């Protein structure tokens, strides 16, 4: 059309993004429609009903770009200097920029200071910690077990990894999903489940509700979740993740980015919107005040918000972890681990079995 359709995951500040669209809309006359559909990262390659712009962490955009689903953005040096270089590196595929970097996200430990004035530093403590908390009618830790994004920091602590990075590229044959480190991490989780210290059916909604209601002393989540906790009148702290084997949890650092559909007749309106309305202190502030973005890619607004201790913890956990790859094989990675984790966690398969399949299906 002559419009702008925009897609962003439901757990972000889409109302604040919609407000940046309405400013753009009235200033130019181009209607903007922001949507947050379920499984949007999977429907986009099916339908690119295609949106003009898609928001997501950069990991999935390399698969979109290799399939030719995204247009190449055209920012000049003057604009590239507005954002931190490493953010551009994360949205770079085969030497060409395929998306706009927006915000750097990482998972952190979030604890209720009225139930837990001092949080544990290790995963081994959680078990005993939960025994003393259930006498109080509470739980120790509750987070999303249906998405490996949240369990991966533990899986990668002892040694697990996704794709080895060698001499500039990621080796698709060096996958660390079945090694001892990953088996150790997932074994700890499955035993906390088998010991009834965790529930396998715990998802994002259940964990967020439980934590924001003071029913569990801890959870694991990212910036976008903070707003909902502020309004829950819960005294919480955002801090480093618990260690495993004395080693830190290693979360995957995602970079929320905006890619332009190749099939979009509105690629220059998209550039104007993303370049001169969203990637400004005012556009980023609007979205951040709706749901926090973390450490934004824009140097000015990020330098401004740098003193937020929750963001300092976020990039501390990120400094322990690794930047996500954008290679198309990441899709296979996330799909195999996810199935493995949910089958081990539920007893359908053993940790060794589940991880053996996954390793092979990723190295196919």
């Amino acid at each position: 059309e002559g419009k702008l359709v925009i897609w962003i995951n439901g757990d972000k500040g889409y109302n604040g993004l919609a407000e940046v669209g309405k400013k753009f809309e009235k200033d130019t006359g181009i209607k903007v429609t922001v949507e947050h559909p379920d499984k949007l990262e999977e429907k986009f390659p099916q339908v690119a009903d295609g949106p003009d712009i898609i928001f997501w962490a950069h990991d999935r955009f390399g698969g979109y770009a290799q399939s030719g689903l995204l247009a190449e953005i055209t920012p000049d040096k003057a604009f590239q200097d507005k954002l931190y270089p490493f953010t551009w590196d994360a949205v770079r595929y085969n030497g060409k920029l395929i998306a706009y970097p927006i915000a750097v996200e990482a998972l952190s430990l979030i604890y209720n200071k009225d139930l837990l004035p001092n949080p544990p530093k290790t995963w081994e403590e959680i078990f005993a910690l939960d025994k003393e908390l259930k006498a109080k009618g509470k739980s120790a830790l509750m987070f999303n077990l249906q998405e490996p994004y949240f369990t991966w920091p533990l899986i990668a602590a002892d040694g697990g990894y996704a794709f080895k990075y060698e001499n500039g590229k990621y080796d698709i044959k060096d996958v660390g999903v079945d090694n001892a480190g990953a088996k150790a991490g997932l074994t700890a989780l499955v035993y906390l489940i088998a010991a009834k210290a965790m529930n396998a059916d715990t998802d994002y909604s259940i964990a967020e509700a439980a934590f924001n209601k003071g029913e569990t002393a801890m959870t694991i989540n990212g910036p976008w979740a903070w707003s909902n906790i502020d309004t829950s009148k819960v005294n919480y702290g955002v801090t480093v993740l618990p260690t495993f084997k004395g080693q830190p949890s290693k979360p995957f650092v995602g970079v929320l980015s905006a890619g332009i559909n190749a099939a979009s007749p509105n690629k220059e309106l998209a550039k104007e919107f993303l370049e001169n309305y969203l990637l400004t202190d005012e556009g980023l502030e609007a979205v951040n005040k709706d749901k926090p973005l973390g450490a934004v890619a824009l140097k000015s607004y990020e330098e401004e918000l740098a003193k937020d201790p929750r963001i300092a913890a976020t990039m501390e956990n990120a400094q322990k972890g690794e930047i996500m790859p954008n290679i198309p094989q990441m899709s296979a990675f996330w799909y195999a681990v996810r199935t493995a984790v949910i089958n081990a966690a539920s007893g359908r398969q053993t940790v060794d079995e589940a991880l053996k399949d996954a390793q092979t299906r990723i190295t196919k």
């Binding site: 010991a195 009834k196 007893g347 359908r348």
Partner: protein, 151 residues
């Protein structure tokens, strides 16, 4: 199934009166969920002795195991619930998902009295797991010299 779910909820939560009601309306004592978890599994791990006794009184299977091979005895010993453990041994070496027995657990977590009662009831001291660790090996690895001594 539906009442059974409610019974699992009351047993897990420690609602002695809710369990009393559900049983009055025909709830199944051995109701199993997706994971083979029964009310006795949940009451034992949650430390509610009163419910444990009631379930047993109603014909609950003591030696029932879940998809992980965990029995009510294993949970009681894993969570250090001595009084429940005794009741479960009163009603009747079962290995778990990694070959670990209730004695491996008591030794791992320093539950001396539980160790005493398990050994007193025929617990296999030679019980091995995937890595070949005996409950003695776990006592020493986790700094439980005292319980290791009794072993």
């Amino acid at each position: 199934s539906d009442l059974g779910r409610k019974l699992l909820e009351a047993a897990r939560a420690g609602q002695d009166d809710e369990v009393r009601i559900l049983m009055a309306n025909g709830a199944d004592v051995n109701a199993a969920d997706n994971t083979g978890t029964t009310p006795l599994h949940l009451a034992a791990y949650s430390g509610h002795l009163e419910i444990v006794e009631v379930l047993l009184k109603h014909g609950a299977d003591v030696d029932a195991s879940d998809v992980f091979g965990f029995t009510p005895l294993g949970l009681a010993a894993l969570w250090g619930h001595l009084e429940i453990v005794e009741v479960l041994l009163k009603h009747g070496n079962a290995m778990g998902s990694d070959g670990w027995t209730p004695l491996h657990a008591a030794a791992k977590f320093g539950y001396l009295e539980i160790v005493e009662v398990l050994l007193k009831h025929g617990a296999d001291v030679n019980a091995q797991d995937k890595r070949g660790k005996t409950p003695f090996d776990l006592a020493i690895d986790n700094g439980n010299e005292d319980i290791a001594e009794v072993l």
